[PDB]
Design a protein around this ligand. Structure first.
Ligand SMILES: Nc1ncnc2c1ncn2[C@@H]1O[C@H](COP(=O)(O)OP(=O)(O)OP(=O)(O)O)[C@@H](O)[C@H]1O
Ligand SMILES: O=P(O)(O)O[C@@H]1[C@H](O)[C@H](O)[C@@H](OP(=O)(O)O)[C@H](OP(=O)(O)O)[C@H]1O
Ligand SMILES: [Mg+2]
Ligand SMILES: [Mg+2]
Length: 240
């Protein structure tokens, strides 16, 4: 995460279709809930051209990145998932907080000045981060910049989740294996606004006005659960 942009290759139609579909909905593009979308672009690849999505790099100019990926939904497979992945998906969904909370730990990075950064594997989700309490603890740890808890940032994160909930309440799309990405630069001040919370990874988004998706995503359920964990954190951080 060095430069201004992420140029993400389109390996299927779904992500690019989604971004294109919502590119004029100000509820998607004006609310600050997804990365700024610049456009789909062809770039030379192979004998021809490969399509990419150009979007903002949410960590552009971050000095000490803090990154937390939280995968949202009550399942992480959809009607197109390959049978050869399904046993694993079913097991991970059930042994992580996915089926119980609709949200799971997906990985974290903290840069506390002794770099290299401290990396926290997404595989922790089925053991160390397999309960609501342990998930709460790990989010609190994300807010630990190495010297203190950044309690002043939490209202921003809850406010972002509220906007997400507001739009997803409308149930126009289903989204599987998408995440909410939490980031901040620990050298930020509140005024520098080097912190962010966005929905990402729309490679399995279904546009319900153009196609049927029978299975439920539990997306809204997950966002509410995550919001309530943050609100607990906001309380736990008061005694500090
Ligand atoms: N717009 C962005 N700005 C900054 N970092 C990003 C952005 N999008 C993604 N990332 C980083 O890249 C990671 C993976 O992103 P994403 O989920 O979109 O990738 P992917 O290629 O779809 O991989 P997978 O499906 O395996 O998760 C995220 O956890 C996040 O750390
Ligand atoms: O969502 P997509 O686009 O299919 O891609 C999957 C995504 O990268 C998952 O995080 C990964 O699980 P891991 O994090 O365990 O690697 C999975 O591997 P899988 O095929 O082993 O389930 C991939 O198929
Ligand atoms: Mg992803
Ligand atoms: Mg993906």
């Amino acid at each position: 995460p060095d430069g201004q942009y992420l140029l993400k290759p389109c390996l299927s139609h779904r992500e690019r279709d989604f971004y294109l579909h919502i590119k004029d909905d100000k509820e998607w593009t004006g609310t600050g809930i997804i990365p700024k979308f610049y456009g789909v672009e062809l770039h030379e690849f192979g004998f021809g051209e490969l399509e990419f999505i150009r979007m903002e790099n949410l960590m552009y100019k971050y000095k000490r990145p803090f990154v937390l990926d939280l995968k949202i939904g009550t399942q992480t497979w959809d009607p197109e998932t390959a049978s050869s992945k399904m046993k694993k998906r079913l097991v991970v969904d059930s042994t992580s907080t996915t089926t119980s909370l609709g949200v799971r730990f997906s990985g974290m990075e903290r840069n506390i000045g002794e770099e290299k950064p401290i990396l926290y594997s997404r595989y922790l989700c089925t053991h160390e981060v397999n309960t609501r309490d342990s998930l709460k603890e790990y989010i609190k740890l994300f807010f630990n910049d190495g010297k203190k808890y950044r309690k002043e940032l939490v209202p921003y994160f809850i406010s972002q989740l509220d906007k997400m909930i507001e739009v997803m309440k409308k149930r126009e799309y289903k989204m599987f294996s998408s995440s909410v990405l939490f980031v901040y630069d620990s050298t930020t001040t509140l005024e520098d606004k080097k912190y962010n919370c966005k929905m990402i990874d729309f490679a399995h988004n279904w546009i319900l006005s153009e196609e049927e998706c029978t299975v439920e995503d539990g997306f809204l359920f997950g966002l509410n659960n995550l919001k309530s964990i943050l609100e607990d954190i906001e309380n736990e951080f008061k005694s500090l």
